[PDB]
Structure formats: structure tokens, C-alpha cells
Amino acid sequence: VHLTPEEKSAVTALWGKVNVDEVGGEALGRLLVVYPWTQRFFESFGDLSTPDAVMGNPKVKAHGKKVLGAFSDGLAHLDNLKGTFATLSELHCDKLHVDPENFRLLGNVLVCVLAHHFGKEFTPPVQAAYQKVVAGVANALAHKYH
Amino acid sequence: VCGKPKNPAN
Amino acid sequence: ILGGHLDAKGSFPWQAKMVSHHNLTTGATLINEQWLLTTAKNLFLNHSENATAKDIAPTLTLYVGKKQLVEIEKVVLHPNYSQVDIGLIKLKQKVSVNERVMPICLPSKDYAEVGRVGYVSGWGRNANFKFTDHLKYVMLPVADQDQCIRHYEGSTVPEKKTPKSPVGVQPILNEHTFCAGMSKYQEDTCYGDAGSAFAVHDLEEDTWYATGILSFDKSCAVAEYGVYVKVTSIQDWVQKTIAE
Amino acid sequence: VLSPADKTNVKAAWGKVGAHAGEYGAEALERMFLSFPTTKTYFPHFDLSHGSAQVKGHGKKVADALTNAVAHVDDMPNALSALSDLHAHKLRVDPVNFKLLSHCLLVTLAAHLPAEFTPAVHASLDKFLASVSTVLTSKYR
Amino acid sequence: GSNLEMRLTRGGNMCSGRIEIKFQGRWGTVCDDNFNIDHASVICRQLECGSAVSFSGSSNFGEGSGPIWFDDLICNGNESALWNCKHQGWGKHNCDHAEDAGVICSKGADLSLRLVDGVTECSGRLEVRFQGEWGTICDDGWDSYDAAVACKQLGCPTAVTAIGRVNASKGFGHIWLDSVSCQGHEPAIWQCKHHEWGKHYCNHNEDAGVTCSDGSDLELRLRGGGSRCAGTVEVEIQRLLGKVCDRGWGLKEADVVCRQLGCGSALKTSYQVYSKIQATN
Ligand code: HEM
Ligand code: HEM
Ligand SMILES: *[C@@H]1O[C@H](CO)[C@@H](O)[C@H](O)[C@H]1NC(C)=O
Ligand SMILES: *[C@@H]1O[C@H](CO)[C@@H](O)[C@H](O)[C@H]1NC(C)=O
Ligand SMILES: *[C@@H]1O[C@H](CO)[C@@H](O)[C@H](O)[C@H]1NC(C)=O
Ligand SMILES: *[C@@H]1O[C@H](CO)[C@@H](O)[C@H](O)[C@H]1NC(C)=O
Ligand SMILES: [Ca+2]
Ligand SMILES: [Ca+2]
């Protein structure tokens, strides 16, 4: 969707400081922990039952990394959203048939992990902007379902 | 008829 | 349905999505070439108990298959509607049977015992409490009837009955109902999932029977057992009705 | 489904919130009008501006309701019955909104109380607000 | 009587559990309807298990199975056996197995009270030994009457009794008693009213503690306000220095401290900067 310059500016400036080797994996393993039925898709990793196993298992953060990157690529060019996730959308929707609502849940746990790290400096307007972002992402990723 | 979906779940 | 199992193939061709007058999406299942079961409850949304069939029939909108709109002639209510929660919808014409659209067989045998597992489809809400954009489905085991009774109310013996229901409203629990347990991953069935059939696939003779229809769809996250009204118990009633 | 573990966790975490429960309740409300303007259509006559006293007090109310619920949590729906009927019937609030406010309340509480939000708690907190928002919604028809 | 057997089941020992009666070779249970301490006293005597200590519903030992043998029992508590109390007859009940009564007897319960990490042997975090294991108690509803009973049992002065944990660590393991509400005349804490054993919502941050004092070791002073009548409120309890938190601190509390200290009335709780003495935990 269209976005006014100071949201995108606060977004990118904030996104610079985001640690790219941890945050994504923490959002992913947190989605796994809070809504354990997604473990169904990832259980090739190992024991996902307790939160400590999840937090330790190197393949959880290994996957999260690729997902966090893919989202960085989304946030980079937000005007052409359809094309960037078109292939990921084929992977998830046609072969896996992940229900697209857990995408937004993940985007929310992401913003949550963001807020967890960034405390008071992650403000309601900047959050509302990232919500807009993870929305546009969830939509573009879900576009081939209709 | 019973029991014949063109593509069942399995 | 809040959790997963996206319906990729359309393995459940008898599932119809009927929307009431105020845009409330609800389940109904196609029980034969001219008829579909549903619940009295589902039928009664946005209408008074005073309302009769002639009043209710034009209000509803019904959808089969993908968008496929089948029209609807009359409506008939179970004589025990307030106890046995079941309607019947008769479709104005026949539906073309094919891979995605086809009625389900009513079971002769009774698979109500614990240890069996079943498959419930649904158009209901999910964990964002949004009406789902695409039909989904879930597998559920069947649950000990006594554990379920003691769960929703307090009693067994009817004088000790009190409203113990985790939600506001009390479900109907009698000898014409059975309870299905919670999922393996704690998935369950929510608003909009009433009227969908609890369909058990019989592997030896390879047929999918509708053993029950979902009555109480309020349980969602909070209430450990969904509860269905056995279809077998309305067996001899539905046949009588089909003749008219 | 709120196991003993969850319940304990939710109590221990919501205690450490204490008297700040009110202002978070209000901060959360602010976010929804800023994040999801459609919820504003339920509050026509309210002053929606930043830190509005009206907002601050309504937030103190929702906060105190929640504290009441968690004080005796093993039967919540009796305690919350009058709010069940208040939001369900009179106000006719569309059930997505409770899940909205639930999530705003979790982000806000997260932001302000970093040390206690280990995943187990984020879990049982989301379950707790689920169970409540249901009980308020569950008399819908 | 040769075909009548009694046992307690699932209470970790032979003196605690759901009531099971063997009759004509089948075990069955007893309903908790009108069940009371006199029934348990009969049972604990019959099993030579000592005095009755606790009764509870099915929640603690789980649901039984089979026939319910007895319901609405009326014992006076002096009968030599439970099946000699007046009853409506074998197998007459309105109960389900979720209403199966259970008991805990004193020889199967094993109770002891101790203080841990106290300033004295009669202050500290309160721990109860139950069936051989020690655990702490949560502070929910813990009041001065409970502390007074504990202090009396330890033989310490009971003129002043504080709640809370001074130098006491957080407990671990079981929380045995919750929401204790005693009247103060009971000779021991486990005969006051409490919820069912081991069912709790407390965490070890909410562990109850006590300090029992005769009042001679309680000092109050103001420090750092330039005089003895202005400053931070410092307290000395059992030779431990600490400070009063301002949460709930109003003009009434300050006026009480100044009046008790002969400093007149509280005018105002303010800043006056200073070199104040630091710090406490
Ligand atoms: C909405 C934001 C999402 C993004 C940006 C994303 C991105 C990615 C990426 C980058 C990969 C790795 C592709 C590769 O190796 O080249 C992947 C794989 C995968 N995605 Fe996601 N994903 C998202 C949501 C989800 C969710 C929520 C699920 C399931 C709950 C899911 C299911 C999967 C699975 C199962 C794989 C592994 C496929 C395999 O290795 O066989 N996707 N995704
Ligand atoms: C966790 C779920 C919720 C809780 C605990 C809650 C709590 C409360 C409380 C305590 C009141 C005041 C009751 C009274 O004054 O008698 C109230 C009123 C109200 N609630 Fe909520 N509420 C919830 C969800 C919602 C949501 C999601 C919305 C809309 C987005 C909403 C809209 C309203 C409105 C419009 C009022 C009336 C305000 C007024 O006119 O004073 N409620 N709610
Ligand atoms: C639904 O029920 C309400 C409550 O009586 C009624 O006023 C309304 O007309 C009905 N229909 C719609 C579409 O809301
Ligand atoms: C809700 O129903 C009204 C009245 O029939 C209609 O105008 C509107 O389009 C419906 N909304 C949806 C989302 O179906
Ligand atoms: C409805 O219940 C009543 C009361 O038991 C019974 O007499 C009647 O036959 C029931 N209806 C049908 C169609 O069986
Ligand atoms: C309190 O602090 C330590 C740690 O428990 C303890 O050894 C000490 O005796 C106590 N304080 C005093 C003043 O005795
Ligand atoms: Ca009785
Ligand atoms: Ca007390």
C-alpha cells in the first residue's frame, strides 16, 4: 500500500539496528512455542516439545534466518510486493498448503520480538507502520489463494 | 454411492 | 477452525456453506441428491422461535462446492428442535454430482464408541476470529461420554446439575448426543462450524459415514470437548421426512 | 485450556504489573485507534486524542475488570457475566475486535515489562486473553 | 466381618488415599456427601492410622470405578468401624465416582514445622515437612493469627508477629498450604482452615515467612532529613536495617510515626536533599 515518507524512514532506520542472526529465529521459535501446532510443519528438526529444545535446536534459527531475510527483501521494495514473494508463495501455498493466517501471526510475533528487544523506543506509530508492512506482506504472500 | 471421493484426504 | 490442515484437494465434497441474513457463515452437509442436513440452531439464527419454516426459507443463502449457488425450496425442522438440534434443507433442483460436489451416505452401523477417530470439516472462524477465507478441516478423536458430561455440567444425576460451562451458555447433552475429544495438538472447532458433519472413514469397506453433526461450536479454544448429535438416532426420522 | 502451569504463570506475571495495570490498559486502547481506525466506530463521542482522560479512565476500568478476573480465575465467566451481556448484546461488538485489543495489550505489556516475557508466559498470557475474549463473545448469536 | 476390608488408595502411603472397601471380593468407594472429620476419625482409628487430619473430594486422588457402597453416612465418631455407622444400605447412592471421599491420617501425613534462613530459629521462611519432604507455604491470605499460632508453637514471644521473608530464599518444590485463615486459638497451623493440599496457584515468590518478636528488638528512626524528625524512615527489626516503601504511604502513616516518636504531626512528605545512608535490600 502507499506509505508516507516518515514511516518508511523510521522503519528503515530502525531495521538497520536489528540483529539479523538472532531476531528472525527467535520470532520463529516463539510462534512454534505459543501455537505449537505449527510444529507439525517443522518437526523434521527434532524435539520441539519443550521451549528449551526449541530455543537450542540450531535448525530452528537456521530456518528463521532465511525467513527474516525474505522479510527484509519484502520491506526493501514494498511497492512491488506480489513479485518478490511469488516464489515463496508457490512453495508454501501449492506444495505445503500452509494456511496464510499463520503468516500474520508470525509477523505479529516478529513485531513482538522487535518490541521485546526495542522496549520503549519502539513506539505506537512505528509499530502501526510495521503492522502495515507485515500486512502488505501477508496479503501479497496470500494473493494466489484467490 | 459411498466411499469414493475423486481425491481423498491421505 | 483456528489451527491448520488447509483443504487442498476438496476431499469433503458434501460440505455446503450457508450464510444467514446478517452475513453469518455456517455449515450444512449434503445428505442426499435432494437434501442436506443442518442444525435447528443454525436455521434459527436472526429469527424468533415464533418464526416458522415459510418465514425462514427465503432468508438464507446457500453455497456448494466453490461458489456454486444452489437454490432452496422448503425447510423442515426436527419436532424436538429444542432437544434434538437438526434441520433439513431441500434444494430446488438436483446438483450435478462430480469430483467436488456429492452427497454423503447416512450410516447403518453406529460408530459412537471411544477409540474411534473422525474428520470434521468447517467454514468457521479461526484464531483471529475472522471468518475463514477458505474451507478447512481437522481430525478429532471421540471422547468418553461421562468425562464430557462431568465436564460441561457437574452432575450425572440430574439434581446436582449446575452451569459449569466455561462459556456463557450451556450445551444440550442427552442420550442422542456424543462427545468428541480435543485434538492431538489441541486444535478445535469454532463459530461457523455448526452443521458440519463428523465423518468417520471406514477403512475395511472404505466408506465415509457421517456419524454426527456438530451442535455446540462455541467451545473453540476454551472447552476440552466438542459435542455432536448422532445422526443414527435421527435415522428413522429423516427417512420418514424424505418421502415428502 | 489453561493448565495449572499456565494459570500460575499468568498470576505471577500479572502481579508484577501491579498498579501500572491501569495505564497500560489505556495505552493499549490508544494503539487501536491509531493502528486500527475501524474500532473508533464503536466510540463516537469519546475524546480519542493522546492520553485523553476519558481514554485513561476507560482503560482503568478494563484494567480493573481484568485484575478481578485473574484474582479469582478458576471461574471467570460468572464474574464477567454482566460484561458478557454488556458487550455481546447492547454494544454488539464484532468478535475480531477482542482479538485486536488482546494483541495490542500483549505488545504494550511486552514493551513495558521485558524481563518476565520468557515464551512460556507469552503463551499463557495469550491463552488467558483468549479465554476471556471468548467468554465475552460466547453469548453472541 | 471377615469379608469386609478397608484400604486407603493413592495417597503415597497406607494412611492416605481414596476410601476403598473390599466386599464379596469387589473394591468400591464411599461418597463425600455429609462426609466430615468424624468419619475420617473413625477411619483413621479403624486403620490404626492415628487421628484424622484431612478430608478431600476426588480432586486429589482421582475418580474411582465400580459401585458406590455408601452415601449420606451419619457417624458420631466413636463407632468401632465405618460399616457400623447408620447407612441407607449397600449400593444406595445418588453420587458419582467424582464425589468419592478421600482421607489423610496423621501417621500417613507426617507434619513438622520449621523456619529456614531466619534471623532466629523462630523467624524465617516457613517450611512444613509433609510425608518426609519439606516445602514452603505461600503468603496468600497469611495473616497475624496464622503467624501467632506458628509463633506460639515455636515457643517464642507472640506480642509482635511480622509476615514476610527476611534473608529467606525462595522455596522450591511443593507449596502445601494456601489461603490459610485461622481464628488464632488452634494449637497448630494444619488444624486451621485451608484449601486442599498441594492444589495451589502460588509461586515461590509468594512464599510466606514470619518474624516472632516480643517488641524489644523493634526500633524506628528517621535518618537523613537533618533532624531525628525528618528524613527517610529507617526501621530496625531483629537487628536488620530497612526502609518503608511509599506505596500506600500517606499522611496518616507519617503522622502515626511522628506521634509515636513524639515528633508531632506529619505536615508533608517531601525532598530535602542530603547525605542519606545507603543502602538496603
Ligand atoms: C509470512 C512470512 C514468511 C516468510 C517471509 C517465509 C520465508 C521462507 C523462506 C525464505 C524459506 C526457505 C526457502 C529456501 O530455502 O529457499 C521458507 C521455507 C518454508 N516455509 Fe516459510 N515463510 C513465511 C511464512 C511461513 C509460515 C508461517 C510457515 C509455516 C507455519 C511456512 C512454511 C514453510 C516451510 C515448511 C518451509 C520449509 C520448506 C522446506 O524446506 O521443505 N512459511 N519460508
Ligand atoms: C478483553 C476484552 C474486554 C474487556 C475485559 C473489556 C472491559 C470493559 C469494561 C470493564 C467496560 C466498562 C463496563 C461498564 O462501564 O459498565 C467496557 C465497556 C465498553 N467496551 Fe470493552 N472490554 C473488552 C473488549 C472490548 C472491545 C474489543 C471493544 C471494542 C473495540 C469494547 C468496547 C467497549 C465499549 C464501547 C464500552 C462502553 C464504553 C462506555 O460507553 O463507557 N470492549 N469494556
Ligand atoms: C438480526 O436480529 C436483530 C435483533 O433482533 C434484528 O434487529 C435485525 O433486524 C436482524 N437482522 C439483521 C440483518 O441484523
Ligand atoms: C452484509 O449484509 C448486508 C445486507 O445484506 C450487505 O449489504 C453486505 O454486503 C454484507 N457484507 C458482507 C461482507 O457480506
Ligand atoms: C419430542 O420429545 C417428546 C418428549 O419425549 C416425545 O414425546 C416426542 O415423540 C419427540 N418427538 C419425536 C419426533 O420423536
Ligand atoms: C541477613 O543477611 C545474611 C544473609 O542471610 C545473614 O547471614 C545475616 O545474619 C543477616 N543479617 C544480620 C544483620 O545478621
Ligand atoms: Ca447423597
Ligand atoms: Ca490468614
DSSP string across chain B: --S--SS---
Give the count of domains, chain A: 1
What CATH number is attached to the domain comprising A71?
1.10.490.10
Contact C12 B9 (CB under 8 A): yes
What crossing angle do the helices spanning A58-76 and A124-142 adopt, rounded to 10°? 100
First to last CA, chain D: 23
Instruction: Report the DSSP pairing between strands E209-213 and C177-180.
Output: unpaired
Closest CA to A11 of A135, A127, A104, A120: A127
SS3 D94: coil
3-state secondary structure A79-110: CCHHHHHHHHHHHHHHHHCCCCHHHHHHHHHH
Closest CA to E156 of E167, E166, E148: E148
What is the C-alpha end-to-end distance of chain E, expressed in Å?
A: 65
DSSP string, A12-57: HHHHHTS-TTTHHHHHHHHHHHHSGGGHHHHGGGS--SSHHHHHH-
Q: Which amino acid is at C99?
A: E
- For residue E180, give Cα distances in angstroms to B9, E138, E154, E187, E263: 56, 9, 18, 14, 39
Q: Say which ligand is closest to the CA of E147.
A: 8
3-state per-residue secondary structure call for chain E: CCCEEEEEEECCCCCEEEEEEEECCEEEEEECCCCCHHHHHHHHHHCCCCCEEEEECCCCCCCCCCCEEECCCECCCCCCCHHHCECCCCCCCCCCHHHECEEEEHHHHCEEEEEECCCCCCEEEEEEEECCEEEECECCCCCHHHHHHHHHHHCCCCCEEEECCCCCCCCCCCECCCCCECCCCCCCHHHCECCCCCCCCCCHHHECEEEEECCCCEEEEEEEEEECCEEEEEEEECCEEEECCCCCCCHHHHHHHHHHCCCCCCCCCCCCCCCCCCCCC
Burial A30-45 (b: 16+ CB within 10 A, else e): bbbbbbbbbbeebeeb
Domain ranges of chain D: 2-139
Residues E159 and A77: their CA atoms lie apart, in Å, by: 74
**SS3 of residue C104 by DSSP:** coil
Rg (CA), chain E: 26
CA distances for D80 relative to A132, A134, C164, D63, angstroms: 33, 34, 14, 13
List own/partner pairs for E73-76 with CB under 8 A and 24 or more apart.
E73/E30, E73/E31, E73/E33, E73/E34, E73/E35, E73/E39, E74/E34, E75/E38, E75/E39, E75/E42, E76/E38
CA E198 to CA D92: how far, in whole Å?
A: 42
Contacts of C240 (CB under 8 A, 6+ apart): none
| A73: β partners | none
Residue C62 C-alpha cell reads as: 446457500
Dist CA D80 CA D83 (whole Å):
5
**E104-136 as b/e: b if 16+ CB within 10 A:** bbbbbbbeebebbebbeebbbbbbbebbeebbb
Q: Write the burial class of residue D44 (CB in 10 Å: 0-12 exposed, 13-18 middle, 19+ buried).
A: exposed
Give me the count of residues in chain C. 244
A143 is in an annotated binding site: yes
Residue owning grid cell 426436527 = C78
3-class SS of residue C69: coil
Task: Tell me whether residue C220 is exposed, middle or buried, using C-beta atoms within 10 angstroms of its C-beta: 0 to 12, 13 to 18, 19 or more.
Answer: buried
What's the half-sphere exposure (Cβ side, CA atoms, 13 Å) at E188?
9
Question: Quick count: other Cβ atoms within 10 Å of Cβ A130?
Answer: 23
To the nearest 10°, report the CA torsion of E170, E175, E179, E185: -100
Nearest Cα neighbor of C132 from C192, C187, C182, C186 is C192
Question: CA triplet C95, C101, C106: central angle to 5 degrees?
Answer: 90
Contact E58, E20 (CB under 8 A): no
From the centroid of its chain, how far is CA C161? 26
Enter the C-alpha cell of residue C26. Answer: 455456517
Match 529456614 to its residue by C-alpha cell. E116
Question: Are the CB atoms for E21 and E30 separated by under 8 Å?
Answer: yes
Nearest-5° Cα angle at C117, E97 to C132: 110
- Burial label for C54, CB within 10 Å (0-12, 13-18, 19+), is exposed
How many Å apart are CA C43 and CA C37, to the nearest integer?
Answer: 11
Tell me, what DSSP letter sits at residue D87?
I
Chain C residues lying within 8 Å of B8, measured CB to CB: 9, 11, 201
Calculate the CA dihedral of residues C138, C142, C148, C149 and round it to 10 degrees: 130
Q: Where would I find the beta strands (DSSP E) of chain C? A: 15-19, 25-30, 35-38, 61-64, 72-77, 87-91, 117-122, 136-141, 177-180, 197-202, 207-216, 226-230
Give whole-number Cα distances, A146 to A90, A104, A106, A135, C7, in Å. Answer: 13, 17, 21, 17, 14
Q: For residues E4 and E22, is the Cβ–Cβ distance under 8 A?
A: yes
Other CB atoms within 10 Å distance of the CB of residue C152: 23
C-alpha cell at A21: 542472526
Cis amide leading into E279 (omega within 30): yes
User: Ligand 7 centroid to E81 CA: how many Å?
Assistant: 20
Cα separation, C31 vs C87, in Å, equals 12
Query: Phi, psi at residue D34, to the nearest 5°?
Result: -80, -40
CB pairs under 8 A between B and C: 32
Q: Which of A30, A71, A91, A144 to mutate to test the pocket of ligand 1 (most atoms within 8 A of CB)?
A: A91
Judge contact between E4 and E83, C-beta under 8 A: yes
Atom from ligand 2 closest to the CA of residue D132: 1
Name the residue at shortest CA distance from atom 13 of ligand 3: C22
Chain C residues within 8 angstroms (CB to CB) of chain D: 45, 125, 127-130, 165-169, 182, 186, 191, 218, 220-222, 224
Long-range CB contacts for residues C60-64, cutoff 8 Å, separation at least 24: C60/C18, C60/C19, C60/C20, C60/C21, C60/C89, C61/C18, C61/C19, C61/C20, C62/C16, C62/C17, C62/C18, C62/C19, C62/C28, C62/C89, C62/C91, C63/C16, C63/C17, C63/C18, C63/C19, C64/C16, C64/C17, C64/C30, C64/C95, C64/C101
Strand partners, C209: C105, C200
The number of residues in chain B equals 10
Residues contacting C242, CB < 8 A, separation 6+: C32, C34, C35
Contact E128, E183 (CB under 8 A): no
Whole-angstrom Cα distance, residue C142 to residue C230? 12
- The dihedral region occupied by E194, where left means phi > 0, alpha psi between -120 and 50, and beta the remainder, is beta
CB of A111 closer than 8 Å to CB of A127 = yes
What is the resolution of the experimental data for this entry, in Å? 5.2
Residue D58 CB neighbours (<10 A): 16
The one-letter amino acid at D67: T
- CA–CA dist D58, D71 (Å, integer): 20
Q: What is the 3-state secondary structure (H, E, C) of E177-221?
A: CCCCECCCCCCCHHHCECCCCCCCCCCHHHECEEEEECCCCEEEE
Instruction: Indicate if the alpha-carbon torsion angle D105, D86, C219, C154 is positive or negative.
Output: positive
Q: Within 6 Å (CB) of ligand 5, which residues are found?
A: C 79-80
The whole-angstrom separation of Cα C131 and Cα C190 is 10
Closest CA to C8 of D64, E21, E98, A95: A95
A6: its cell numbers: 516518515
Residue in C80, C84, C240 to alter for ligand 5 test, most ligand atoms within 8 A of Cβ: C80
Residue nearest to atom 8 of ligand 5 (CA): C80
For residue C111, what are the CA distances in angstroms to C117, C118, C179, E134, E254? 10, 10, 12, 51, 74
Pick from C130, C168, C222: CB nearest D84: C168
Neighbouring C-beta atoms of residue E141, cutoff 10 Å: 16
Which uninterrupted H or E stretch holds D5? Answer: helix D4-15
Q: Which of B2, B3, B9 sits opposite C119 (nearest CB)?
A: B9
Q: In angstroms, what CA-CA distances link A23 with A111, C57, C108, D123, E186?
A: 10, 54, 56, 18, 57
Using alpha carbons, list the distances in angstroms from residue C55 to C22, C44, C46, C67, C76: 15, 11, 12, 25, 12
* CB distance E103 to E174 below 8 Å: no
φ, ψ of residue C209 to 5 degrees: the values are -100, 145
Distances (CA, A) of A39 to A35, C7, D15, E95: 8, 18, 31, 43
Q: Which of C26, C20, C31 is nearest to C57 (CA)?
A: C20
Measured from the Cα of D69, ligand 2's closest atom is 5
Reference C194, options C47, C40, C84; nearest CA is C40
Q: Helix (H, G, I), strand (E, B), or coil: what is residue C87?
A: strand
Can you name the residues that pair with C199 across neighbouring β-strands? C119, C210
Q: Please report, in angstroms and rounded to a whole number, the separation of the first and last CA atoms in chain A.
A: 19
Q: Which residue, C191, C54, C201, is CA-closest to C140? A: C201
Distance between CA E30 and CA E18 in Å, rounded? 8
- Which SS3 state, helix, strand or coil, does residue C105 take? strand
**Structural domain for A20, as ranges:** 1-146
Task: Give residues with Cβ within 8 angstroms of E171, minimum separation 6.
Answer: E125, E127, E135, E136, E204, E207
Nearest CA, atom 5, ligand 5: C80
For the domain made up of D2-139, give the CATH fold. Globin-like (1.10.490)
- Residue pair E167/E143 in contact (Cβ under 8 Å)? The answer is no
Please return the burial class of A28, using the count of CB atoms within 10 Å of its CB with bins 0-12, 13-18 and 19+: buried
Q: Which three cell numbers, joined as nine digits, stand for E160?
A: 509482635
Around Cβ A124, how many Cβ atoms within 10 Å? Answer: 20
Question: Phi/psi of residue D10, each to 5°?
Answer: -65, -40
Query: Cell numbers of E36, please?
Result: 466430615
CA distance D5 to D9: 6
